[PDB]
């Protein structure tokens, strides 16, 4: 049962416990419009294989990822394992990784992928290089885990953008699960409270307990410093 293929200090594979049992009935199609890591996405595919999986993130760098490991596995493993093999020293491997800019698709997959596992918690911006990320989380074990997977994903649909699209999308039976970065350009809690109001599907929210969280939710279902928000009785 793989949990992660990303590091993500926001990353649920350890609120699956909470999450999984909490699901609606009957739901036939899944979304994670804010995915980053997809725990939650990994682990739906993994536990009711006829649903119908949609993920997406505004992280272009990020979706180029999970598109390349969904439609060019083999060659994005190989690029990998390639550089790790060529890069013995990580700080050389950063600064490499780091002074790129642009790119196709698979360019920025492999990137992505590596500043991932080099990086303080997943992230340049939130902590830059990692040498302990280089030597214990850039691992053989790490990259052995892609091709399972690649296997796991081989049938979502992957977008890039907004998480409105996947709040309106016409569906039947749709459970969206969304994972919002935390309370505090930074993301707009405004914007997102006045489009999941409207949302004609059965959404999950998780957010860190706030007294302006509890206020903005005020007119959804609140569970319990994690919270769970619903528009459906748990
Ligand atoms: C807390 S993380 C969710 C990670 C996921 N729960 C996991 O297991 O790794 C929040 C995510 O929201 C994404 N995001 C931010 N603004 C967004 C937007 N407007 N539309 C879609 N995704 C967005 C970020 O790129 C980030 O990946």
Redesign the pocket.
């Given at each position: 049962m793989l949990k992660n293929v990303?590091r993500?200090p926001?990353?649920?594979s350890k609120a699956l416990k909470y999450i999984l049992p909490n699901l609606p009935v009957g739901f036939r199609e899944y979304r994670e419009?804010?995915?980053?890591?997809?725990?939650?996405a990994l682990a739906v595919k993994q536990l009711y294989t006829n649903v119908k999986i949609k993920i997406?993130?505004?992280?272009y760098d990020?979706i180029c990822f999970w598109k390349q490991l969904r439609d060019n596995p083999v060659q994005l493993i190989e690029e990998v394992s390639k550089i790790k093999e060529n890069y013995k020293d990580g700080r050389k491997l950063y600064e490499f990784l780091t002074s790129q800019n642009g790119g196709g698709e698979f360019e920025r997959a492999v990137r992505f992928y590596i500043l991932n596992r080099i990086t303080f918690s997943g992230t340049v911006d939130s902590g830059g290089y990692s040498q302990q990320s280089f030597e214990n989380r850039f691992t053989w074990s790490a990259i052995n885990k892609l091709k399972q997977a690649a296997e796991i994903i081989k049938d979502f649909e992957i977008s890039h953008?907004?998480?409105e699209k996947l709040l309106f999308e016409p569906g039947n039976e749709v459970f969206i699960f969304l994972?919002?970065?935390?309370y505090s350009l930074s993301?707009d809690h405004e914007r997102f409270a006045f489009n999941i109001k409207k949302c004609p599907h059965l959404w999950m929210i998780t957010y860190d307990d706030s007294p302006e969280v509890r206020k903005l939710f005020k007119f959804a279902n609140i569970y319990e410093k994690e919270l769970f928000i619903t528009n459906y009785k748990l």
């Open positions: 990303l993500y926001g990353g649920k419009p804010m995915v980053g890591g997809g725990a939650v997406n993130d505004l992280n990020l953008g907004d998480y994972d919002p970065p935390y993301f």
